[model samples]
Target: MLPSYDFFIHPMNLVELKKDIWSDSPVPAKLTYGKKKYDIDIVYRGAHIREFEKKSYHVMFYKPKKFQGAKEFHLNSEFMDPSLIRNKLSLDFFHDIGVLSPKSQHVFIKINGQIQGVYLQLESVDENFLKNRGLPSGSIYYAIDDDANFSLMSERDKDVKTELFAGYEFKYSNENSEEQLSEFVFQANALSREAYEKEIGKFLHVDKYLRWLAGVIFTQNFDGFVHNYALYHNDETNLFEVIPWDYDATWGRDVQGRPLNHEYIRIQGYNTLSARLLDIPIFRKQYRSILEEILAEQFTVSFMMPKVESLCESIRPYLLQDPYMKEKLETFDQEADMIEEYINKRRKYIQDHLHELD
Candidate 1:
């Protein structure tokens, strides 16, 4: 069985929480695990899935010292995903490919003695995320919506934004994230092609961004480019870097767990910053080279299927008795095949479109 936790929320908090399920405001709750108990705060988390019977949550601890790394955690119900391993697999692929990605685990969640089912336990991309990974202290901004598209123009109306950081919510930083990120967005869009080629590296980790982009493109997350990511400003490098987030909407599946076409996203990917970076010949070459490298080495089914198998094996048995998504073991097996086939199709798609980078 996967590791489990028991939460004991007061009945009144559940009543109050249901009153306005969309609020970010948290309610008090207590958690027990193997005779150990701790006080915690719970809040409903996610967009559109709030109305679902099985809900996701953002839990936080009062003190940092209580749990070994207890600052915050995200327990995603993965109700939409039948396989329930897409996000976990995608994150692992990104991590293995040398991009900085949040770690994830699948665990059992029980609330008030009722088994809530298997949850995709995601590590929050905050201060501890960098600390745990030995990354430098940095500022993090989550792309909350399409407006985080790094565009001078807002995605809503294609009109100029009052501030460049329109769709981003700054998560962690002691630095002036406002001025820094806004300026980076402005320059990413404002600089001329020659000027951008000359100076964009000072503002972003170009190679790193390309690798992150490759991961998204390979996984075929159509919406990942404009949103579903976080930008980190490394205090040491002073250059902003990209991190993947909400990637469950990937691996030939959309956010709500619908089947997505394999050839959806282009080789170079999208977004204002990416467009500018790719406009320059050298960066385009670098990006194309990165894509070729990954396709040759990692994106193949032979390289990735074992990981898919291992992740499924761990969560499959627990899912048999899951309260939220109790899919047949065969359905779980089918998802693995779907993912494997997507990789083959995506490799061919990328191979066909690599000329687009030219």
Candidate 2:
């Protein structure tokens, strides 16, 4: 028998979703709760216990509701899901530390079941990444005119800011660090060097970026997805930033907990054309150093143990006590260990290649 909340619906007059159906959108069945006049479409999910059956998912984009940008809205279904809780908390951690992230809120709603949760609100970027930085192939490269003047911060700092722009074409650097090779400019569409440096660079500034990246793999056994990691650029400042998005597949499946294939470097680069373009030797070396620093610091089971335990304790009740959600958590747990061996191997590879500097 399932618990009172097993139906996967809010307690209000809305509707109840069963455990065996497939949905195309988010869960909790996006419907209007009586509290608000507008009908909000929400996504919902259902679990399947049968070996051959797959988990069901759904997305709801109901009629546009009147949402005032002034106020905050909470997520209705995520409060009960451990995966959801982890993600929300992770966002909070980022914001408190000041990493230029989105704002989050917790709100309540009554659909078929009384559902509560974390809802996030973020401002859109002023300019699209590509639009902000024109093509590197153009005047952006050779156009590097040294800044003739520098901002007068203090009497000793009377220097000019020489801005070297995007026009610098990609050149080949052979093993002979001193040798000059051919230039290899990117020929693909989408993704850019500016975007890569900005997004990934900003992320690295946060002491927790690498740690969290590794933690998601170790604890959640996540499969890395590039889209989930987004790039945002500010046109005014000509600065780029990376945003962590979409963690639906986070948490582990249990076996090896591998996030990606053993070749994480290749995966990191090839995951998107942008990554591949900026996968330069210098940057790779820097990334390795950062990764080493993080692993040597906390990534230990000791670090994740308490956090994971707390998560399970706080989140499991919502899933375990319910027959359907229990099926969901257990099923996903089986895949947690996929990156187990690979993560360690990659770590060592990074360390060994440390001296080589890429």
Candidate 3:
């Protein structure tokens, strides 16, 4: 059987989407868009369902012929205008920087005299796509810079029970083993003392992956973590690749307000360090080169700064366009400077700790 899923939405997502998707901002409403007509419903909020006083959102599955092009997340139209723009900007930067991410488009809906709703639609992944290629369902998860958010609590006081999807969790195996195993498989493991090192070894390509990752992070000035990434395998072609999601947080002055521990698995150290130090050349090579690569990229301020500024500019107009949405982005704007200061301070810590790999 598939792993049991915990159904819930984060309180923040509820508030953000509700505020953005509606004009008068009522509690329950429904919208249909496009020729095929993908729909969104902001239905009733309940105690067991994590009530939202403003609105809560869900998509329509009874998609019409015009919506044949709609994918799982791409029909995502319900957030504020700034969020819509940030999403577009983030996708562009990550793709240009050679990181994989979901395809996005900016859209606006007007009812009466005002911009009533704004959202971005994402390309959805399906099981059929995996089966056609024979990729492991668990193959696609990256642990480096991932972040998470949470949903509202039920009246029963069971926050985790019906979570709003907050908190960072692992998406891959341990560091030593990333070269060989898939993320889904690794995340499925239940840690035990005896199985610990073995479990970790399943994903320990840290040094190499991290080096590659640092260049991406430094080059893009991306304020993100490993949780921003996901993976899938191609059975027919036998390939595994990572895709980044959630780009609205990109191109800022510096990494601030966003907690490193909350947003990045990269800073987690050797909590899941692999034990098979003697087993593979790939692992050995990562230790030697990936760290050096990350360090080398750290000095590439010329390359990193331009990208950061461009990233901010790219999303600035989209953020400012929404009268109702600008505040959420303003908060993020202040955070950008704070993040910049915090990141510079944190960089020194990484430099001091380079020898931890041995």
How do the candidates rank by TM-score, highest first?
1, 3, 2
Compare the candidates by lDDT and give the number of the best one.
1
User: Model 3, stretches more than 4 Å misplaced?
Assistant: 1-70, 74-100, 105-121, 127-231, 237-281, 291-323, 327-348
> Between the candidate structures 1 and 2, which one is better when assessed by lDDT?
1
- State the lDDT of candidate 1 residue by residue for 1-358, as single tens digits: 6878999889999898888999999999988877778788999999787878889999898733345564888989877777888888888889888789988889898999998888898999999888888889879999887688888897578689978878888899665888889888988888899798778888888888999999989887778888788999998998998899877777888875778753387777888778888889999999999998998889988889998989889988788778666756677779988888788787888899999988
Residues 153-188, candidate 3: write the lDDT tens digits. 233454432322223233333443343332423332
lDDT of all the models against the reference?
Answer: 0.85, 0.34, 0.40
For candidate 1, the C-alpha RMSD (Å) to the true structure equals 1.7
Least accurate stretch of 10 residues (summed lDDT) in model 1?
61-70
Query: In terms of TM-score, how similar is model 2 to the real structure?
Result: 0.44
Regarding lDDT, does 2 or 3 come out ahead? Answer: 3
The full ranking of all candidates by lDDT, starting with the best, is 1, 3, 2
Q: Using Cα atoms with residue i matched to residue i, what is each candidate's TM-score against the true structure?
A: 0.95, 0.44, 0.47
Question: Clashes in model 1: which pairs?
Answer: none
Which digits, one per residue and each the tens of the lDDT, describe model 2 over residues 15-83? 333342344343433444334443444433323311212222232324442344312132334322334
